[PDB]
């Protein structure tokens, strides 16, 4: 009577009497796998049609879904008090296909992700709303993945008697050929055979998936699930995460900073063992967390640090953390600095303290495009936009890892490589960025990240040369240690996409004149700071050149590292040219830049 059997009934289509209360079917998938020995995605669909906009649907109690016409609200999780909870904003009136994602594995992820397609009346997929994130806890993602209920009742419906159609309603599995990367990115939408052709579109190129994912193979378990063609409005893929008990901002700066998903820190149980976590991220998320609660402003970062170096027993908790790993807390802070900044101007309504718990949205961006945007609902988060990051050029030869010692599995012929590929994929070099161990791992991995720096607001943007001499200055921490030592950095090697160096401007007027701010302004086009744009000059008066990238420009950069080391013996010292690797050299010569603004 209350039951009804989804996968038989709604495979095709189902009409659902709602009148007489709630419905409901249980969803069943064989336990073998849930129990799997290798890795998969379990992808749950249905379109909702007549009567979608008057329902409170859900799975159990871990997924809840309030339909009203205007908006879909999602909420839930295995964590009690506040639940996770998303709101989307209907951009149609119509059909719209329900999903979400089960992860399946011994090292999967313990969270689900949920996301909606608006349909046209040709059943073309016309809107995607973003992929939100719920947290479930690995027992009851099996449960979910095992038996769990599916409810549907009407909610504040106008209909005498309420009805719900439903059709296409199935489940299938993904089982790849273990690596979790594009779970968490929008490339997840590359592991989902009814998706296909969508990120190539959206995020303007390839899946380009590791072996792993590249052979996947997918079958229907249950039902007849859609497979829709596409008519989707041009915006990029995104993802949301919602932190019912705040601390946002901290979790991005630790996922930024170290390279570690964004989600790990949303985990119903916390990772043990996990030496990159243990070190750099709790340690980063707890600086963060450490700096907010002593409400300080974030345009103070740079004397916090001062200070806290400068006398120790002082600054508190906080002074403290900052001690413990100098280079670590300028790297957390600066970029925590930078978003809370950006935050704080996006609206009216966004302020300093709400930086620190509003939702994280990050963006599947264009490297061609123009400046990467978030949904019109975006503007209330966190934003991060990501792109191609030197982790995906630094070809065959083992793990890749930043040391005194120097960088591991990191040759010439590596470099050689590597090279190769950017050019294959349309990057140019630009040049050299040193900086420290911490900094350098958060680059080339995780990508370049907005910091707060100490220098008018016009000047704002990532330094680099292209003159390995200059930059190598720059690779090393800048503060002594308890035993007189300094430890040495890293160089690195920037590149763009050949697409924007339209936008590399150059000047012979030394950066530092006083016309310099207006010459600049004039050669870009716009008022400072420098946006998808970037400037060379000399440094100073006679001096080797430097180049900024606006932040915008530097966020799409492919950073990987120079073969080019840094001399532990030596901190401090110029770098020796016979240290210089001919064939580097060969692959150095910098780009044509415009001396004139664009006609
Ligand atoms: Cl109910
Ligand atoms: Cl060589
Ligand atoms: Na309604
Ligand atoms: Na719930």
Known sequence: ??????????????????????????????????????????????????????????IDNALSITSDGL????????????????????????????????????????????????????????????????????????????D???????????????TLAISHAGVSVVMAQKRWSEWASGKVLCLLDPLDGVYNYLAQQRCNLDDTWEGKIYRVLAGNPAKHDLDIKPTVISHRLHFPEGGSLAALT????????????????????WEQLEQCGYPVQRLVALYLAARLSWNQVDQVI?????????????????????????????????????????GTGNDEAGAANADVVSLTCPVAAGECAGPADSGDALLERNYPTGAEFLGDGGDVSFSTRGTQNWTVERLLQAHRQLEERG?????????????????????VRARSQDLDAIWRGFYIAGDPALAYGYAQDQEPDARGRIRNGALLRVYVPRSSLPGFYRTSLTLAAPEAAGEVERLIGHPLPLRLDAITGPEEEGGRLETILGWPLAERTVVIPSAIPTDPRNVGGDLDPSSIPDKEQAISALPDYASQPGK
């Open 1 to 58: 009577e209350e039951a009804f059997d989804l996968w038989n009934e709604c495979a095709k289509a189902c009409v659902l009497d709602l009148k007489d209360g709630v419905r409901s079917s249980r969803m069943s998938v064989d336990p073998a796998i849930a129990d799997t020995n290798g890795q998969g995605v379990l992808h749950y669909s249905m379109v909702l049609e007549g009567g979608n906009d008057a329902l409170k649907l859900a």
């Open 71 to 146: 908006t879909i609200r999602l909420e839930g999780g295995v964590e009690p008090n506040k639940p996770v909870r998303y709101s989307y904003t209907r951009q149609a009136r119509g059909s719209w296909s329900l999903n979400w994602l089960v992860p399946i594995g011994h090292e999967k992820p313990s969270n689900i992700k949920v996301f909606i397609h608006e349909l046209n009346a040709g059943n073309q997929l016309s809107h995607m709303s973003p992929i939100y994130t719920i947290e479930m806890g690995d027992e009851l993602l099996a449960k979910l993945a095992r």
């Open 148 to 162: 769990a209920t599916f409810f549907v009742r009407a909610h504040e419906s106008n209909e005498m008697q309420p």
């Open 254 to 273: 630790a996922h930024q900073a170290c390279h570690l998903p964004l989600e790990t820190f949303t985990r119903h149980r916390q990772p043990r063992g």
């Open 306 to 346: 001062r200070n806290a170096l400068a006398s120790p027993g002082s600054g508190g908790d906080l002074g403290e953390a900052i001690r413990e790993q100098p280079e670590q807390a300028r790297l957390a802070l600066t970029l925590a600095a930078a978003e809370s900044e950006r935050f704080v101007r996006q």
């Open 427 to 447: 990057y140019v070099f630009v040049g050299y960025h040193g900086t420290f161990l911490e900094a350098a791992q958060s680059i080339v991995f995780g990508g």
